[PDB]
Amino acid sequence: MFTKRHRITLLFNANKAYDRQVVEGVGEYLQASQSEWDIFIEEFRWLGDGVIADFDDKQIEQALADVDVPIVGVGGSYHLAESYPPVHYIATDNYALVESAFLHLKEKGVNRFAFYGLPESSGKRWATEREYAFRQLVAEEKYRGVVYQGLETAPENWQHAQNRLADWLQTLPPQTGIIAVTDARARHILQVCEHLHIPVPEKLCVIGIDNEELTRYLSRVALSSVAQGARQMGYQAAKLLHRLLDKEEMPLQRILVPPVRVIERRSTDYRSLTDPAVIQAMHYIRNHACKGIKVDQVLDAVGISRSNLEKRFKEEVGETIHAMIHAEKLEKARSLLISTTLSINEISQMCGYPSLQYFYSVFKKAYDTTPKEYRDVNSE
Amino acid sequence: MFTKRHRITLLFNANKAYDRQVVEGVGEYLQASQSEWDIFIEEFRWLGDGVIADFDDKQIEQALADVDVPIVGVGGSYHLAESYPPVHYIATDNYALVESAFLHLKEKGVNRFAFYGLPESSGKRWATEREYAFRQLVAEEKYRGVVYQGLETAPENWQHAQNRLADWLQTLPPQTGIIAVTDARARHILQVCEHLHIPVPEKLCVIGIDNEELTRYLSRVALSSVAQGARQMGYQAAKLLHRLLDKEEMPLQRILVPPVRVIERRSTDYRSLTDPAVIQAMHYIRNHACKGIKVDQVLDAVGISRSNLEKRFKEEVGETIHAMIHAEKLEKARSLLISTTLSINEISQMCGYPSLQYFYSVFKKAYDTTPKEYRDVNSE
């Protein structure tokens, strides 16, 4: 008779992708265990028989400090072991996350490293934790790392904040890889580069930390990111809380979960390019190839004569401008198949192809499957 | 030179799955068009050069009424054409949504229909719209439909609300299919059935309308749902706003997008069962088969002698209790492969299998692929 029910309270934020992942793991546990739990996503802030909560929040910790019922905290890791709150704790491995992104940029020949973080001013201790890790694994590189804490998440002066970020960005030499604390901060870099037409990744490379597509700002350049092991975190949390509900004795748990993987998108697609003019020209093309652009537009974007730009393209890419314009139409098309929900007809049309048959033809030449086949094998 | 930038303001709610889908479509458009837009998810509530907003919100409509810049409203459809707000409008087809769920239950022999809605008290006009549709397509069924508006989303008295929902549920004859306005309301039905041990779907069938897994309450019985065409909605919205930004003349658009599909889960998995004792016994099994239960527990759950229950199981299922216990261990396992992120090892263990090899063996007998193969071909 499975009659005893437990009310379970989850203190997270439905509006942030990471929080949503954690709760989904909790839900996964519910499914796998078929527990007689009544789980409430109760966060705004009665309390149940067990709690799982966001402990990246000092307020929550203070609210919960002295609560009798089992609590499993979920939040960021800490280099110092005595900085962990007095509760069982599932942790995202802050070090590993930065490491994961560092190793990604490392593999792409990048040896100039930059970090866009978050002021001490915010209460974000995982930010400090990530910055420290950055410094730790950047220590032995050819050129030194450079760190720039921001102004604040919701600036008291957006315009001013933008100016300061713009200033810092123009400071950074070509082929600098930037690690942002959060996809949100990464997108902040991308919008400024948009304002300024700074080539990403042709000039500077950008990588984030959440794998969240919905941040304050949406970015035309798709954002590479470290995906946290957030589902697994929520699952392990519930699994532990279950043992805590069976009155099991235990020293306070500190289990670290590493990132799942890096999702490689456009923003880190660096191909060893170095000539400033090809850099700006290649960026231009990667923005507007689908819009049916001629070599003339590319020439006008940089301020260069046809002869000279062709010479340099040949020099650095072994292909023509015209050829690269069209190779990129394909790339846009290939991405959308992979990262989007559009019909193939829509992809063809939005990518400036004359007919869906023509795209089919061109696509089947470059890769060997069909647009359709390639989608099933490679989607998301 | 693609130098003119447009600031775009989106007025939606990051915390609700439907809103998040809509914004993702907007993002899809950004990708496919590589527009020089600066898109802000600005909703709490400066304004940009174009707006896309949740027009299921009378406050937003009033806030925006008299704004000079292009606006594309997104929200629910209306049976009456004069109830649409004075703006270009992308609509989810409220009728089609109910229809989609109705047709799903219809296909499963269901001919007793119920609707859990939302009081007039809330400002939710899509709720009224869905209820009306329900009534419209339930008109010709054998038994009449029954509608129950709730107490309110965040009750002024949770306990009281639960009592009233419990009352209504015990009113409903076996093999009643319930359509809820929203996965949220559906889950409210499921938690009460949990409190009361009312078999779903063995006794009553439940289907929702959003395909959202994260609602106020998490449900042990996975929830079947209609998935709205919400991405496409957001994409079409941005695509229209783009034409509006190119100063194109147009009569106020009213384009309806139908649901994508119905996601069939446990909550609508009705297999023509009718004997009350098998109903309760089968529900029991579907909850605890993985927990290593004997025939004795099933006997105790209903209040029936072994002989009699076996007789009835044979009569309605052509299988033994013992046999069905084990067929369901497999089903739990098969689901988790399909709907979850767990490792196969974890699935085996949580489903009460003695070894991963044994599960492999049993799984390969029932279906012909391996747990691994079946995951790649059938996941999500």
Ligand SMILES: O[C@@H]1[C@@H](O)[C@@H](O)OC[C@H]1O
């Ligand atoms: O690590 C997370 C960070 O990346 C951001 O998403 O905000 C919540 C944090 O816990």
Ligand SMILES: O[C@@H]1[C@@H](O)[C@@H](O)OC[C@H]1O
């Ligand atoms: O149709 C949607 C409904 O299902 C719910 O999710 O709330 C928002 C509505 O627009």
